Amino acid sequence: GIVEQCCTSICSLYQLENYCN
Amino acid sequence: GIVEQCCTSICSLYQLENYCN
Amino acid sequence: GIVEQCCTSICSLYQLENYCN
Amino acid sequence: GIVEQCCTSICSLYQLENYCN
Amino acid sequence: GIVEQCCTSICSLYQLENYCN
Amino acid sequence: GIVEQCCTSICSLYQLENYCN
Amino acid sequence: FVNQHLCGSHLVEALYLVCGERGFFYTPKT
Amino acid sequence: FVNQHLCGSHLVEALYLVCGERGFFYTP
Amino acid sequence: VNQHLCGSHLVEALYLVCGERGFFYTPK
Amino acid sequence: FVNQHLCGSHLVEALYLVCGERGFFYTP
Amino acid sequence: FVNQHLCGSHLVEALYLVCGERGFFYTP
Amino acid sequence: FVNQHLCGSHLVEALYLVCGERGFFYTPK
Ligand SMILES: [Cl-]
Ligand SMILES: [Cl-]
Ligand code: NA
Ligand code: NA
Ligand code: NA
Ligand code: NA
Ligand code: NA
Ligand code: NA
């Protein structure tokens, strides 16, 4: 999930956009 | 400047990146 | 919904809870 | 105090409410 | 209060410091 | 830089002000 | 509208705190 | 897990900006 | 709502300005 | 400790939301 | 009302995210 | 854990407050 992915290492804008509805 | 451009109408990610170094 | 309701007047935490999953 | 209680474990809004005036 | 004092016009750091304990 | 100076020990306002234009 | 954009930022923070493990959906659409 | 709680606050702020009118779901 | 949004930023500013002194926030 | 400093910033935003018109003392 | 100041706070947060390692400049 | 990134977000908020009309550059690198 986003917490596991993006709280452990920094997510780029593109990686964050993966989690948009 | 960024305040004039972005404080009435919402700036997109692309527009915001105009103000990066 | 939430914008029309909670950006035009202050919503209580109870009102905000209605928008939870 | 609040830091000892709520920075070492997550405090809910109910626990935080105890600190209101 | 602070809202009347600091939400109509920006408060300086000195003005904000008034509310420190 | 500011991250090295201020991300383990808390920087004061005076210390932060050195990074202003 | 930037006013709504700014309000929404605060709304999602509020929902994050209020909803807890329930989570929430948000859209600024509207 | 306070670390994740704090991170999540920043994540939802980031998703709010990035997702725009698409919106997003979030759960901690 | 304007005053509500302002207050959120006010408390963040007081937190930084006041440091270990802490602060008193009342909208009264 | 900066970790506590950052935590506290989020605490006061949460207190602002929860306490509403009551307000609050923040006395770390 | 302090709308410009509030807008600026959110703009700086957005620039921080968007600009990443490039960094940014903020002038009100 | 994304601690340095989170710290920086709060640092730029602090600079925004303290620098006032002076503004600031933020340069992580
Ligand atoms: Cl705002
Ligand atoms: Cl944080
Ligand atoms: Na306006
Ligand atoms: Na005082
Ligand atoms: Na230290
Ligand atoms: Na307005
Ligand atoms: Na702020
Ligand atoms: Na902000």
Ligand SMILES: [Zn+2]
């Ligand atoms: Zn705001």
Ligand SMILES: [Zn+2]
């Ligand atoms: Zn944070």
